[PDB]
Design an enzyme around this catalytic site. Sequence first.
Site, PDB file in Angstrom:
ATOM      1  CG  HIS A 188      -1.885  -1.295   1.257  1.00 41.76           C
ATOM      2  ND1 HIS A 188      -2.902  -1.499   0.067  1.00 41.76           N
ATOM      3  CD2 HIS A 188      -2.194  -2.110   2.117  1.00 41.76           C
ATOM      4  CE1 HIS A 188      -3.526  -2.583   0.461  1.00 41.76           C
ATOM      5  NE2 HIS A 188      -2.992  -2.987   1.721  1.00 41.76           N
TER       6      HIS A 188
ATOM      7  CE  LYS B 205      -5.075  -6.845  -1.845  1.00 39.43           C
ATOM      8  NZ  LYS B 205      -4.061  -6.176  -0.929  1.00 39.43           N
TER       9      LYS B 205
ATOM     10  CG  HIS C  74      -5.209  -5.805   7.336  1.00 40.87           C
ATOM     11  ND1 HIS C  74      -4.461  -6.749   6.894  1.00 40.87           N
ATOM     12  CD2 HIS C  74      -5.430  -6.215   8.741  1.00 40.87           C
ATOM     13  CE1 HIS C  74      -4.053  -7.867   7.789  1.00 40.87           C
ATOM     14  NE2 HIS C  74      -4.645  -7.789   8.796  1.00 40.87           N
ATOM     15  CG  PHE C  75      -5.894   0.648   2.228  1.00 40.33           C
ATOM     16  CD1 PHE C  75      -5.149   1.911   2.547  1.00 40.33           C
ATOM     17  CD2 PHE C  75      -6.960   0.912   1.632  1.00 40.33           C
ATOM     18  CE1 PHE C  75      -5.516   2.847   1.984  1.00 40.33           C
ATOM     19  CE2 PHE C  75      -7.548   1.943   1.258  1.00 40.33           C
ATOM     20  CZ  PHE C  75      -6.714   3.231   1.407  1.00 40.33           C
ATOM     21  CG  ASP C  76     -11.549  -1.574   6.610  1.00 43.05           C
ATOM     22  OD1 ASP C  76     -11.340  -2.857   6.373  1.00 43.05           O
ATOM     23  OD2 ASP C  76     -12.483  -1.140   7.026  1.00 43.05           O
TER      24      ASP C  76
END
Length: 124
Positions: free
Chosen positions: A12, A41, A119-121
Site C-alpha cells: 500500500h 488481487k 491492512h488497508f480497509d
Amino acid sequence: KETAAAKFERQHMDSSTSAASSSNYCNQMMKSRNLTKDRCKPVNTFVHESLADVQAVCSQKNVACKNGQTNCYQSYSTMSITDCRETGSSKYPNCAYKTTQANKHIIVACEGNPYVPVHFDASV
Ligand SMILES: Nc1ncnc2c1ncn2[C@@H]1O[C@H](COP(=O)(O)O)[C@@H](O)[C@H]1OP(=O)(O)O
C-alpha cells in the site's frame, strides 16, 4: 520473514510519485509489488504520502472496520492515493487493472507494538 507492517508498506505505500500515476501505473505496480504472483488481487490501493503520515493514522479517528473489528482508523486529512481495480478482461497471469487517482481520507487497520498499519480497509 516479512512482518505484517512490512507487508502493508509493500502492498500500500508508494511515497515516491507524489501522485502522477499513468494509465499503466496499476498494471506495473501491482506486478512490481508481487500482488499478481499467485493470482489477481481484485482491488488494491496505494498511498502517496510519507510513511510517518500514514503511520500517524493509527492515532487518529477510530472507526469500525468493514469486517466488524474495532481497530480501524480514518485519517483526519485527505491523502493522495491510487486505486487499482482488475478489469473485466484481465486474465491471469496477465492481470490487468484500471488506475484511478484520488484525494480521500484513508481507513487502515492497526495492530501490534508499535501500533502500526497492517491492512488497508477503505477510502472515503
Ligand atoms: N487476516 C486478516 N485480518 C483482517 N483483515 C484482513 C486480513 N487479511 C486481509 N485483510 C483485509 O481484508 C480485506 C480483504 O482482503 P483479501 O482480499 O486478502 O481477502 C482487505 O482490506 C485486507 O487488507 P490488506 O489487503 O491490506 O491486508
